[PDB]
Amino acid sequence: NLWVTVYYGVPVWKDAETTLFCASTDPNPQEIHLENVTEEFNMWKNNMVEQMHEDIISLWDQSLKPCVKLTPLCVGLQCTNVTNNITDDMRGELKNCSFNATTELRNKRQKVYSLFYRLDIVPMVDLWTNYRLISCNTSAITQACPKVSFEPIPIHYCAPAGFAILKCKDKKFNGTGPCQNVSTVQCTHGIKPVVSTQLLLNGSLAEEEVIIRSENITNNAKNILVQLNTSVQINCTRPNNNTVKSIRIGPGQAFYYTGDIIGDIRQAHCNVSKATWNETLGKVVKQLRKHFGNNTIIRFAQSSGGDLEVTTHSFNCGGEFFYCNTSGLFNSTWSITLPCRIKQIINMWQRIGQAMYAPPIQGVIRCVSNITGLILTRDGGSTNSTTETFRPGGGDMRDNWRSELYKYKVVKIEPLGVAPTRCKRR
Amino acid sequence: TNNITDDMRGELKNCSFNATTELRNKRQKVYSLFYRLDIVPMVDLWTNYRLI
Amino acid sequence: SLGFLGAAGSTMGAASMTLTVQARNLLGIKQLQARVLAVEHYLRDQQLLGIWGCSGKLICCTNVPWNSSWSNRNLSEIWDNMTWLQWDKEISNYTQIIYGLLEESQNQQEKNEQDLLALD
Amino acid sequence: GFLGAAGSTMGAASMTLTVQARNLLSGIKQLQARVLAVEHYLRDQQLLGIWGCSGKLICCTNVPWNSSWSNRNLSEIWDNMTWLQWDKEISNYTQIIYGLLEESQNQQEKNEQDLLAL
Ligand SMILES: *[C@@H]1O[C@H](CO)[C@@H](O[C@@H]2O[C@H](CO)[C@@H](O[C@@H]3O[C@H](CO)[C@@H](O)[C@H](O)[C@@H]3O)[C@H](O)[C@H]2NC(C)=O)[C@H](O)[C@H]1NC(C)=O
Ligand SMILES: *[C@@H]1O[C@H](CO)[C@@H](O[C@@H]2O[C@H](CO)[C@@H](O)[C@H](O)[C@H]2NC(C)=O)[C@H](O)[C@H]1NC(C)=O
Ligand SMILES: *[C@@H]1O[C@H](CO)[C@@H](O[C@@H]2O[C@H](CO)[C@@H](O)[C@H](O)[C@H]2NC(C)=O)[C@H](O)[C@H]1NC(C)=O
Ligand SMILES: *[C@@H]1O[C@H](CO)[C@@H](O[C@@H]2O[C@H](CO)[C@@H](O)[C@H](O)[C@H]2NC(C)=O)[C@H](O)[C@H]1NC(C)=O
Ligand SMILES: *[C@@H]1O[C@H](CO)[C@@H](O)[C@H](O)[C@H]1NC(C)=O
Ligand SMILES: *[C@@H]1O[C@H](CO)[C@@H](O)[C@H](O)[C@H]1NC(C)=O
Ligand SMILES: *[C@@H]1O[C@H](CO)[C@@H](O)[C@H](O)[C@H]1NC(C)=O
Ligand SMILES: *[C@@H]1O[C@H](CO)[C@@H](O)[C@H](O)[C@H]1NC(C)=O
Ligand SMILES: *[C@@H]1O[C@H](CO)[C@@H](O)[C@H](O)[C@H]1NC(C)=O
Ligand SMILES: *[C@@H]1O[C@H](CO)[C@@H](O)[C@H](O)[C@H]1NC(C)=O
Ligand SMILES: *[C@@H]1O[C@H](CO)[C@@H](O)[C@H](O)[C@H]1NC(C)=O
Ligand SMILES: *[C@@H]1O[C@H](CO)[C@@H](O)[C@H](O)[C@H]1NC(C)=O
Ligand SMILES: *[C@@H]1O[C@H](CO)[C@@H](O)[C@H](O)[C@H]1NC(C)=O
Ligand SMILES: *[C@@H]1O[C@H](CO)[C@@H](O)[C@H](O)[C@H]1NC(C)=O
Ligand SMILES: *[C@@H]1O[C@H](CO)[C@@H](O)[C@H](O)[C@H]1NC(C)=O
Ligand SMILES: *[C@@H]1O[C@H](CO)[C@@H](O)[C@H](O)[C@H]1NC(C)=O
Ligand SMILES: *[C@@H]1O[C@H](CO)[C@@H](O)[C@H](O)[C@H]1NC(C)=O
Ligand SMILES: *[C@@H]1O[C@H](CO)[C@@H](O)[C@H](O)[C@H]1NC(C)=O
Ligand SMILES: *[C@@H]1O[C@H](CO)[C@@H](O)[C@H](O)[C@H]1NC(C)=O
Ligand SMILES: *[C@@H]1O[C@H](CO)[C@@H](O)[C@H](O)[C@H]1NC(C)=O
Ligand SMILES: *[C@@H]1O[C@H](CO)[C@@H](O)[C@H](O)[C@H]1NC(C)=O
Ligand SMILES: *[C@@H]1O[C@H](CO)[C@@H](O)[C@H](O)[C@H]1NC(C)=O
Ligand SMILES: *[C@@H]1O[C@H](CO)[C@@H](O)[C@H](O)[C@H]1NC(C)=O
Ligand SMILES: *[C@@H]1O[C@H](CO)[C@@H](O)[C@H](O)[C@H]1NC(C)=O
User: Fold this and answer.
1) Where does B1-52 show beta strands of DSSP type E?
2) Which positions ≥6 away from D116 have C-beta within 8 Å?
3) Buried b or exposed e, range A23-52, using 16+ CB within 10 angstroms
4) What glycosylation sites does the entry record (chain B) (predicted)?
5) What is the enclosing helix (H) or strand (E) of C108?
6) Residue A269 is inside which H or E element, if any?
7) Are A239 and A268 in contact (CB under 8 A)?
């Protein structure tokens, strides 16, 4: 009675992993809401996070190729103390280091004197030198081009023809499971590739409430990503009127360094309010209690030691990589100012062999910045769920980008299908 | 300098040279064993060979 | 008027009215790989329709009868009470048998038409 | 020759459609150029396919001509105009015509689906 009828253009899809376009090529966005659908999402199996990670690494590596190498500056340094007025907390933090640098001429050196942060130098004992640059015994140092900025620029990931991106609009979406309010887009919204290690800055806020996302909430080896519904503002500054000088080290190689600091030296601090931070932590704890016992005491603590790039909270305020100390922020059991250390020679992500030198920017650097999320890690159930301790632990950078790509899934369109009809060909 | 057989006489040489280090303005004295086929004689002062 | 995949959650007998909306949306190294793979997927689907004798059509009727072992349902529940996604899931791993039957039926039809057109 | 009939009248240029055809299909820049030519060819072939004109160069349809698109008679259109001038004259309605053509095919297959269901 019934016959096979072939249809082409069937609105069905399968989960798939394909290559996405990076648009910024400004797209004309479209969004089609899908009525009466349910789609299973899994933010921790989303290939878009791995592809975004690879794209950011490739763009970063490409940006540093046509730039000045600092190979001739891997020389011994004669470092002494800074003669300006400093406080007790900054004793030994900044050093005045002299060295012999090359010039455009191959057989004519030049004495130089430059201020360096203590974190950027390592002791090395010789008759006339005291320190060397931290990375010169591990890898070449490449100077970032001063014409190229670091500041995140929102980008869009776009599926190729034959593929589509599904967006989950459900409130209180925990990152996995079914989603009912699902729409189809060709390109994602503008996602800022913001680089941070403990707090998520300039990201997306939750529509309804604080959302706690974990691949396995009972596995203490996985990170917990907390998205806030309200932002908490961070005011960061390096209160030092830095005077930047430069020297020519090769035929086309110009090197930039700290020349001097005008006036007294004061430390580099980020201010977060106390009323809103206390409300934020109360909300986070209230949401945590829904994944643990209702009478379990939840306490926050300082991060563990080891690997300064992880133990501190990074930004890219101005053009200078801060590294703040959240120990005074999470020291509570359920304003505020954070001493931030400055480095210039940065090994970003967890790579070894590619060292980038961030040149200083003249003047003061002050930036205000929305905190939109947190990365928390649990210490472990050593008390049998009597008391739980959470720390602002670090993790791979994928966790920050996943915190934006959790709403998107890539699906492959399958235009063909078959179905019974009474239609017989002849 | 070792217990070298007749077949290996002149085939392996103990050579020393001034190599650079991770620092531009430092030098180190390094010695190594090279095969004769990797070396070409050179007439100079304080040296008598170069690498091919 | 619903847009691309707008009918995806609608019933099969309603979503079948929007086949042109889906069809029109099917068309540096990474960008070329994405464009070439989209072209290859389109061309494989078009060749597969051509092998079945359905070239140039979006709704193509054939001469393969429906087996009750593939889906023991009536037309009302298939077309009016379920979506194409649920149907596609229901007949998963039965499509290769259907495709083979469609290929063989078209080969037989082409031979029969050639023999009919060979009569003087 | 290729585009030789571009300056001829449409009645004469319509007989050289196979001459204009075949010239549509035949280090990274050359590969991008080849992919772009293939993409444009396939977009045009899909656009013909959704109209029920697949495999044909002269395809008759069921969409009536609207006098608001052009009020010229067939003698003036086909004997006194080239394809370039005609294309310029009706460009502002081309997509509307395409939409109507698509709609006709959407009806046509359904009618055929019903006729074969008897
Ligand atoms: C999070 O977003 C805020 C808001 O965009 C970022 O702060 C803004 O950053 C821009 C770009 O660096 C600043 O513009 C700069 O201003 C200085 C002023 O001297 C100028 O010299 C630079 O050339 C550039 O124009 C802007 O001032 C700043 N605005 C505010 C209100 O803070 C912030 O950097 C972002 N945070 C992260 C971690 O990406
Ligand atoms: C860093 O050290 C340099 C010397 O290597 C200082 O430069 C000297 O500063 C004194 C200040 O009284 C001057 O009188 C000298 O003429 C300077 N010499 C040169 C060669 O510039 C520099 O001031 C030091 N900077 C800081 C911040 O302590
Ligand atoms: C920078 O160059 C100067 C060149 O004068 C170095 O000073 C001399 O260094 C040699 C050894 O390299 C000593 O024997 C001389 O006595 C030094 N001269 C003086 C006046 O002190 C200086 O040491 C170099 N600095 C660094 C950090 O390498
Ligand atoms: C190659 O030559 C070097 C130096 O000419 C030798 O190194 C010395 O070896 C003697 C033993 O004969 C030691 O007492 C010295 O302390 C060594 N000096 C250094 C600087 O290492 C080396 O042993 C020779 N190797 C061979 C295989 O003949
Ligand atoms: C610099 O001064 C501090 C105390 O002000 C002292 O502890 C430190 O050793 C000094 N460093 C040098 C290199 O003189
Ligand atoms: C480079 O020096 C630092 C100084 O502590 C050391 O930890 C590191 O292991 C050194 N690199 C290598 C490759 O040995
Ligand atoms: C998200 O919520 C759904 C609701 O049923 C639940 O089944 C799923 O396990 C949750 N996932 C996570 C990661 O909390
Ligand atoms: C889906 O989310 C959007 C977000 O604004 C909302 O407007 C829409 O009503 C939601 N859909 C349903 C079915 O609730
Ligand atoms: C954020 O969530 C808290 C949860 O108590 C709620 O009180 C507050 O109004 C929410 N804010 C917004 C802007 O949704
Ligand atoms: C993963 O989650 C399940 C859910 O109950 C849990 O039983 C399991 O122990 C978790 N994995 C680990 C490694 O703890
Ligand atoms: C400092 O922080 C508060 C709250 O975070 C913010 O409202 C204010 O505008 C900031 N002020 C400055 C001068 O950065
Ligand atoms: C941070 O707080 C300190 C405390 O006095 C203040 O001096 C500084 O101006 C604040 N920073 C900003 C950017 O407002
Ligand atoms: C942050 O400050 C606390 C104050 O006790 C200190 O113990 C901790 O080591 C500091 N963080 C880092 C990364 O040094
Ligand atoms: C630093 O001091 C110099 C003195 O000439 C002044 O011109 C400059 O504006 C100052 N910069 C800041 C950021 O205060
Ligand atoms: C930060 O939060 C405030 C709160 O209203 C918002 O108006 C502002 O645009 C946010 N800034 C950024 C850079 O996201
Ligand atoms: C070293 O080896 C060469 C190889 O022919 C030989 O001629 C020479 O005499 C040897 N010299 C010594 C000191 O053994
Ligand atoms: C969703 O289901 C309701 C149930 O009757 C139906 O009326 C509606 O049309 C469906 N949505 C679509 C897009 O067809
Ligand atoms: C298809 O139908 C035939 C009879 O028409 C039956 O024997 C065969 O088993 C069916 N196919 C399957 C996969 O069961
Ligand atoms: C189709 O089968 C279902 C299965 O129970 C039945 O409920 C429905 O009434 C049937 N419809 C027709 C038209 O036979
Ligand atoms: C074939 O498809 C049906 C559809 O549900 C499924 O239940 C069955 O397991 C599939 N066969 C195999 C061997 O997986
Ligand atoms: C050009 O116009 C003249 C007018 O007489 C005509 O004879 C000629 O054939 C036309 N050219 C072509 C290529 O048709
Ligand atoms: C012809 O076009 C006009 C507007 O361009 C439209 O109003 C009219 O309905 C069209 N003709 C027919 C027969 O639909
Ligand atoms: C076509 O219209 C034109 C108007 O300029 C007229 O001159 C010509 O005679 C018409 N042709 C026919 C065949 O009616
Ligand atoms: C098409 O529209 C543009 C502006 O919309 C107008 O300038 C042009 O003349 C129109 N073309 C015709 C053939 O009328």
Assistant:
1) 12-20, 27-35, 39-41, 49-51
2) A423, A424, A425, A426, C61
3) beeeeeeeebbbeebebebebbebbbbebb
4) 3, 14, 18
5) helix C95-116
6) strand A268-272
7) yes
Contacts of D41 in chain C (CB under 8 A): none
C-beta separation of A387 from A243 below 8 A: no
- In this structure, which residue's CA is closest to atom 10 in ligand 24? D92
Do the Cβ atoms of C71 and A2 come closer than 8 Å? no
D81 close to D10: Cβ distance less than 8 angstroms: yes
d(CA A284, CA A287): 5
DSSP states of A31-53 = EEEETT--EEEEGGG-HHHHHHH
Rounded distance from Cα A370 to ligand 15 centre (Å)? 6
Taking residue A121's Cβ as centre, other Cβ atoms within 10 Å add up to: 19
3-state secondary structure of A353: coil
Q: Which amino acid is at D32?
A: Q
User: Which ligand neighbours the alpha carbon of A168 most closely?
Assistant: 8
Tokens 């040149």, located at residue: A359
Closest CA to A340 of A237, A233, A416, A197: A237
> Are D20 and D32 within 8 A, CB to CB?
no
Torsion of CA C33, C38, C40, C44, to 10 degrees: 160
SS3 D33: helix
A183 close to ligand 8 (CB < 6 Angstrom): no
List the determination method. cryo-EM
CA pair distance A184, C21, nearest whole angstrom: 14
The neighbouring-strand residues paired with A187 are: A158
Q: How far apart are CA C53 and CA C55, in angstroms?
A: 6
Contacts of residue B22 in chain A, CB cutoff 8 Å?
Answer: 74, 136-137
Q: How much helix, strand and coil, in percent to the nearest 5, is found in chain C?
A: 60, 10, 35
Tokens for A131, please give them.
Answer: 């320190």
Residue C47 to residue C11: CA distance in whole angstroms: 28
Contact of D14 with D21, CB cutoff 8 Å: no
Please say whether the beta carbons of B40 and B29 come within 8 A: no
Give me the amino acid identity at C13. G
CA distance D12 to A395: 72
CA separation for the pair B25, A72 (Å, rounded): 9
Say how far apart CA A367 and CA A324 lie, in whole Å.
14
User: What's the farthest any 2 CA atoms get from each other in chain A?
Assistant: 99
Q: Which of C61, C60, C119, C69 is nearest to C93 (CA)?
A: C69
Minimum CA–CA partner of A23 in chain C: C31
Question: What tokens does D34 get?
Answer: 């080849």
- A68: helix, strand or coil: coil
* Nearest atom of ligand 21 to the alpha carbon of D12: 14
Distances from the Cα of C73 to the Cαs of A11, A390, C3, C67, D21, in angstroms? Answer: 21, 54, 30, 10, 48
Task: Give the span between the Cα atoms of D55 and C49, in whole angstroms.
Answer: 14
D111 touches chain A (CB under 8 A): no
∠ CA D69-D73-D74, nearest 5°, is 105
Q: Ligand 9: which of A210, A226, A228, A229 to mutate, judged by most atoms within 8 Å of the beta carbon?
A: A229
Strand partners, A224: A214, A376
CA A185 and chain centroid, separation: 26
Resolution of this model in Å is: 3.3
Angle formed at CA A231 by CA A343 and CA A294, multiple of 5 degrees: 105
Work out the angle at residue C61's Cα, subtended by the Cα atoms of residues C45 and D100, and round it to the nearest 5 degrees.
75
**Cα A186–A188–A190 angle (5° rounding)?**
140
Give me the amino acid identity at D77: I
Q: Which helix (H) or strand (E) holds A183?
A: strand A182-185
- Residue C108's Cβ-count burial label (10 Å; 0-12, 13-18, 19+) is exposed
Length of chain A: 426
